[PDB]
């Protein structure tokens, strides 16, 4: 290795089957908790280990340095971005953007062209740089009760251009 690697991981049924992945999931849980201090740790753990959620992990030298936890809604035509974070010492180097670009490529391949997410006010600018907007095109009837709403957050959407 010696270089960064992208891995789409998660818990398919039980996290005890693959210990390498389990270690990465715990690593993600910790990174998410550390960079998302206002989010209950038990809450982060619950979602990161939920079989319906996947996490695109950014690993360098076997260690998790960032990731995006998401949930795919193929029939609804979109994916919910649940957690997004890069460990502090690795931030401001381009990894956060690198992670989102990789996630976009993955979804273009699965033919899902919309991301929905609830952004904390002080993170809005990050999403805007990644092409997200406060203008929502996915109908409310399509996401209400599907995506989780948060306190004081702003719903934002990213329309992916397959090119
Ligand atoms: C659904 C949610 O998860 S909402 C919560 C989102 N997450 C967090 O707030 C957790 C704490 N923050 C982080 O983990 C990081 O700051 C991340 C993941 C947002 C960004 O990761 P990084 O690796 O630092 O970002 P990267 O180096 O790719 O920078 C992305 C670009 O966004 C820009 N940007 C604009 N506004 C912001 C902002 N509010 N925060 C961060 N970046 C911003 C940066 O200037 C940078 O552009 P530049 O390189 O041209 O200057």
Coordinates of C-alpha atoms and ligand atoms in Angstrom, one line a residue:
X1 CA 0.0 0.0 0.0
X2 CA 1.7 3.2 1.2
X3 CA -1.0 5.2 -0.6
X4 CA -4.5 6.3 0.0
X5 CA -7.3 3.8 -0.9
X6 CA -11.0 4.1 -1.3
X7 CA -13.2 1.4 0.1
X8 CA -17.0 1.2 0.2
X9 CA -17.7 -0.7 3.4
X10 CA -20.4 -1.4 6.0
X11 CA -22.2 -4.1 7.9
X12 CA -24.1 -6.5 5.6
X13 CA -25.6 -8.4 8.5
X14 CA -23.1 -8.8 11.4
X15 CA -19.8 -6.9 11.6
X16 CA -18.0 -9.8 13.2
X17 CA -17.4 -11.7 9.9
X18 CA -14.7 -9.4 8.5
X19 CA -12.4 -8.0 11.3
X20 CA -10.5 -5.7 8.9
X21 CA -13.8 -4.0 7.9
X22 CA -15.0 -4.0 11.5
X23 CA -11.8 -2.2 12.5
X24 CA -12.3 0.4 9.8
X25 CA -16.0 0.9 10.8
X26 CA -14.9 1.6 14.4
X27 CA -12.3 3.9 13.0
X28 CA -14.9 5.7 10.9
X29 CA -17.2 5.9 14.0
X30 CA -14.4 7.5 15.9
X31 CA -13.4 10.0 13.2
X32 CA -17.1 10.9 12.6
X33 CA -17.6 11.4 16.4
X34 CA -14.5 13.5 16.7
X35 CA -15.3 15.8 13.7
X36 CA -19.0 15.8 14.5
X37 CA -18.9 16.6 18.3
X38 CA -22.6 17.7 18.4
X39 CA -23.7 14.2 17.1
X40 CA -24.4 11.6 19.8
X41 CA -21.7 8.9 19.6
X42 CA -24.3 6.1 20.0
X43 CA -26.2 7.7 17.1
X44 CA -23.2 7.7 14.8
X45 CA -22.4 4.1 15.8
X46 CA -26.0 3.0 15.1
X47 CA -26.0 4.4 11.6
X48 CA -22.4 3.4 10.6
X49 CA -23.3 -0.1 11.6
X50 CA -26.8 -0.2 10.0
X51 CA -27.0 -2.7 7.2
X52 CA -28.9 -0.2 5.0
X53 CA -26.1 2.4 5.3
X54 CA -22.7 2.2 3.5
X55 CA -19.6 4.3 4.1
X56 CA -17.0 5.3 1.5
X57 CA -13.8 5.1 3.6
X58 CA -10.6 6.9 2.8
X59 CA -7.8 4.8 4.2
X60 CA -4.0 5.6 4.3
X61 CA -1.6 3.0 5.7
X62 CA -4.4 0.9 7.0
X63 CA -5.9 3.7 9.0
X64 CA -9.2 5.6 8.4
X65 CA -8.6 9.3 7.7
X66 CA -12.0 10.2 6.4
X67 CA -15.3 9.0 5.0
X68 CA -18.8 9.6 3.8
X69 CA -21.6 7.6 5.4
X70 CA -24.6 7.3 3.0
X71 CA -27.8 5.5 2.2
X72 CA -28.9 4.6 -1.3
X73 CA -32.5 5.0 -2.2
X74 CA -32.5 3.6 -5.8
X75 CA -36.3 3.6 -6.3
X76 CA -36.5 7.2 -5.0
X77 CA -33.7 8.2 -7.3
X78 CA -31.4 9.6 -4.7
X79 CA -28.9 9.0 -2.0
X80 CA -28.8 10.5 1.5
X81 CA -25.5 11.8 2.7
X82 CA -25.5 11.1 6.5
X83 CA -22.0 11.8 7.8
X84 CA -19.1 13.5 6.0
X85 CA -15.7 14.0 7.6
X86 CA -11.9 14.0 7.3
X87 CA -9.7 13.7 10.4
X88 CA -8.4 17.1 11.5
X89 CA -4.7 16.6 10.7
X90 CA -5.5 15.6 7.1
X91 CA -8.0 18.4 6.4
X92 CA -7.4 21.3 4.0
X93 CA -5.4 19.1 1.6
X94 CA -8.2 18.2 -0.8
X95 CA -9.4 14.9 0.7
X96 CA -12.9 16.1 1.5
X97 CA -13.4 17.0 -2.1
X98 CA -11.6 13.9 -3.3
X99 CA -14.0 11.8 -1.3
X100 CA -17.1 13.5 -2.7
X101 CA -15.8 13.2 -6.3
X102 CA -15.3 9.5 -5.7
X103 CA -18.8 9.1 -4.2
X104 CA -20.2 10.9 -7.3
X105 CA -18.4 8.5 -9.7
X106 CA -19.7 5.5 -7.7
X107 CA -23.3 6.8 -7.9
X108 CA -23.1 7.7 -11.6
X109 CA -22.2 4.1 -12.1
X110 CA -25.2 3.0 -10.1
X111 CA -27.4 5.5 -12.0
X112 CA -28.3 7.6 -8.9
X113 CA -27.9 11.3 -9.8
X114 CA -29.1 13.1 -6.7
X115 CA -27.6 13.6 -3.2
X116 CA -29.7 15.0 -0.4
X117 CA -28.2 16.1 3.0
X118 CA -28.8 18.2 6.0
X119 CA -25.9 20.6 6.4
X120 CA -24.9 22.3 9.6
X121 CA -24.7 26.0 8.9
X122 CA -20.9 26.2 9.2
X123 CA -20.4 23.4 6.6
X124 CA -22.7 24.8 3.9
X125 CA -19.7 26.3 2.0
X126 CA -18.2 22.8 1.7
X127 CA -21.3 21.4 0.1
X128 CA -21.6 24.5 -2.2
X129 CA -18.1 23.9 -3.5
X130 CA -19.1 20.3 -4.2
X131 CA -22.1 21.6 -6.3
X132 CA -24.8 21.3 -3.6
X133 CA -27.6 23.9 -3.4
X134 CA -30.4 25.0 -1.1
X135 CA -32.7 24.7 -4.1
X136 CA -34.2 21.2 -3.9
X137 CA -35.4 19.5 -7.1
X138 CA -36.3 16.0 -5.6
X139 CA -40.0 16.3 -4.7
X140 CA -40.8 16.5 -1.0
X141 CA -43.1 13.5 -1.3
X142 CA -40.1 11.5 -2.5
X143 CA -37.8 12.2 0.5
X144 CA -40.1 13.0 3.4
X145 CA -39.9 10.1 5.8
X146 CA -37.0 8.6 3.8
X147 CA -34.2 10.9 4.8
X148 CA -33.6 11.9 8.4
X149 CA -34.2 15.5 9.3
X150 CA -31.9 17.3 11.8
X151 CA -32.2 20.2 14.2
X152 CA -31.0 23.6 12.8
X153 CA -29.7 22.0 9.7
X154 CA -30.2 23.2 6.1
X155 CA -31.5 20.6 3.5
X156 CA -29.2 20.7 0.5
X157 CA -29.1 18.8 -2.8
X158 CA -26.5 17.9 -5.4
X159 CA -27.6 17.2 -9.0
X160 CA -25.0 15.0 -10.5
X161 CA -24.0 15.5 -14.2
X162 CA -23.1 12.1 -15.7
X163 CA -21.0 14.0 -18.2
Ligands
LIG1 C1 -24.3 15.7 6.3 C2 -23.1 16.5 7.2 O1 -22.3 15.5 7.3 S1 -23.1 17.9 7.6 C3 -21.4 17.9 8.5 C4 -20.3 18.0 7.5 N1 -19.1 17.7 8.3 C5 -18.4 18.4 9.2 O2 -18.8 19.5 9.5 C6 -17.3 17.7 9.9 C7 -16.1 18.6 10.2 N2 -15.4 19.0 8.9 C8 -14.7 18.2 8.1 O3 -14.6 17.0 8.4 C9 -14.1 18.8 6.9 O4 -13.9 20.3 7.1 C10 -14.8 18.5 5.5 C11 -15.1 17.0 5.3 C12 -16.1 19.3 5.4 C13 -13.9 19.0 4.4 O5 -12.7 18.2 4.3 P1 -11.3 18.7 3.8 O6 -10.4 17.6 3.4 O7 -10.8 19.7 4.8 O8 -11.7 19.7 2.6 P2 -10.9 19.9 1.2 O9 -9.5 20.1 1.5 O10 -11.4 19.0 0.0 O11 -11.6 21.4 1.0 C14 -12.8 21.5 0.3 C15 -13.1 22.9 -0.2 O12 -14.3 23.5 0.3 C16 -14.1 24.8 0.7 N3 -15.0 25.2 1.7 C17 -15.9 26.3 1.6 N4 -16.6 26.5 2.7 C18 -16.2 25.5 3.5 C19 -16.6 25.1 4.9 N5 -17.6 25.7 5.5 N6 -16.0 24.0 5.4 C20 -15.0 23.4 4.8 N7 -14.6 23.6 3.5 C21 -15.2 24.7 2.9 C22 -12.6 24.9 1.1 O13 -12.2 26.2 1.0 C23 -12.0 23.9 0.1 O14 -11.7 24.6 -1.2 P3 -10.3 25.1 -1.6 O15 -9.4 23.9 -1.6 O16 -10.5 25.6 -3.0 O17 -10.0 26.2 -0.7

